[PDB]
């Protein structure tokens, strides 16, 4: 898969440059290198009550990557085993049923959470082969704890069955869960904001006039 595999390689390679000092401008430069200006990201899982699906546009994408780190990750990379490449008129699909999102957690309790699932990517077929669409349907997940730290807290039972617990609910830390939940609702408001930025009105009156409008789009 000589053209697109390499793009996922470069994505991982850059994610090796992350530091704790990486802010909004750094994540924006990263996203701009790997994502088209109108790209769309999607996570999907099952959690504890039923299937869940979160889709965010381009500007909300950097903080998505940042969310994984700010929940305890110190490095991140994707492993795609046997992805299926397909070339089309104007884009290239990469469809990997055996996709793995791996994150290492820092000091203390140097744990590794490996999230398994289906990664579907659509790249544009141009010189800067950037991602148009990113879709991650999460199935299972694992949390692995160093056999070093098992020996450490091995004779501290009340504390140590604490380490039979789980850091993440679905492979996603609470950071990302809460971020994507907030995105669900703030992202459609962006049009109201534009209304606000242009016509001078109250945010509630913006909401009103937009809602007011959108029945007629339908006719």
């Amino acid at each position: 898969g000589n053209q697109t595999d390499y793009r996922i390689f470069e994505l991982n390679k850059r994610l090796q440059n992350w530091t704790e000092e990486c802010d909004n401008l750094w994540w924006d430069a990263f996203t701009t290198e790997f994502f088209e200006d109108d790209a769309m990201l999607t996570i999907t899982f099952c959690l504890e009550d039923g299937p869940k699906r979160y889709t965010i546009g381009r500007t909300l994408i950097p903080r998505y990557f940042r969310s994984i780190f700010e929940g305890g990750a110190t490095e991140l990379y994707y492993v795609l085993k046997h992805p299926k490449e397909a070339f089309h008129s104007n884009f290239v699909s990469l469809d990997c049923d055996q996709g793995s999102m791996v994150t290492q957690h820092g000091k203390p309790m140097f744990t590794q959470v490996c999230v398994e699932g289906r990664l579907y990517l659509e790249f544009m077929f141009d010189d800067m082969m950037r991602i148009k669409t990113w879709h991650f349907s999460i199935r299972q997940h694992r949390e692995l704890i160093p056999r070093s730290i098992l020996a450490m807290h091995a004779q501290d039972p009340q504390m140590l069955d604490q380490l039979s617990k789980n850091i993440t609910r679905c492979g996603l830390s609470n950071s990302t869960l809460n971020y994507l939940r907030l995105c669900v609702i703030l992202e459609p408001m962006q049009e109201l904001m534009s209304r606000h930025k242009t016509y001078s009105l109250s945010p509630r009156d913006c909401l009103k006039t937009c809602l007011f409008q959108k029945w007629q789009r339908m006719v």
Partner: protein, 85 residues
């Protein structure tokens, strides 16, 4: 222009919380805040309740949209309409 830095966002949040404290009736806390963070730039503010209050309240309204909580917590109707339709 461009993308807000973390500094710029923290500054905008600080000033808009100052305006919030003013319109909520927290003058003492407003100026105690202004120098507990060493603010030095000329302020100008808009009508009550202010930027943060208005936007936050329509956010929390849209919070009770059709997905998840919906009709479990009090909510508007125009918000649920903005979501479903």
């Amino acid at each position: 222009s461009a993308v807000p830095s973390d500094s710029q966002a923290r500054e905008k949040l600080a000033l808009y919380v100052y305006e919030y404290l003013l319109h909520v009736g927290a003058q003492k806390s407003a100026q105690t805040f202004l120098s507990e963070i060493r603010w030095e730039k000329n302020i100008t503010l808009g009508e009550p309740p202010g930027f943060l209050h208005s936007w936050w309240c329509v956010f929390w309204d849209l919070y009770c949209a059709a997905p998840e909580r919906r009709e479990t917590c009090e909510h508007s109707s125009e918000a649920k309409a903005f979501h479903d339709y």
